């Protein structure tokens, strides 16, 4: 689909869910859970997974 | 010991090491990992357990 | 029109364009420039000019 | 002299006396003036200038 957010932090997984990210990578979110991570789909890296939600920011 | 950091976001863990922080808790940051992640003690809860680095700010 | 992100560092003005910033802060961010910098307007103060992106965080 | 800071946050500078700033960036700071920014020197760069005093931590 569309892409949705974009990291602003470097994130650096520590678990297997977790998502990596570099700075200003177009990302896919799939879903906002009520704990604050984000699933997503890493358009650069094609993979998915989740990471904090501050470490993302909506495009628009 | 004294106090370093403090949480600016809120983060709720999803894994056995990550440690809960509410906004404005006082941490005292015992290691800053190469990986961008944090080993800390939650003044306010009395617990021990890692978090992503941006989620703190140091107090100075 | 509606507010869009919140200040969440202090940041005080060197050169004419910059806006003034406190901390919480309600900011109408009208450009997310390529450089890194947002040109807001700052709900607070009723003031217009530009800051350093890390300085704030969407309100969502 | 030595290493006092290291930057966190990417800085592009918009102004003359700004000093630009990659992630992880060493840092040697001459002075922390009374308005928020720091004078300091990049030895990654070996430049001079200034930059917002939150975009970088101490190492210690």
Known sequence: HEQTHRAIFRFVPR????????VDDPLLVELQAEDYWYEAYNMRTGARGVFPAYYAIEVT
């Open 15 to 22: 678990h297997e869910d977790e998502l990596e990210l570099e």
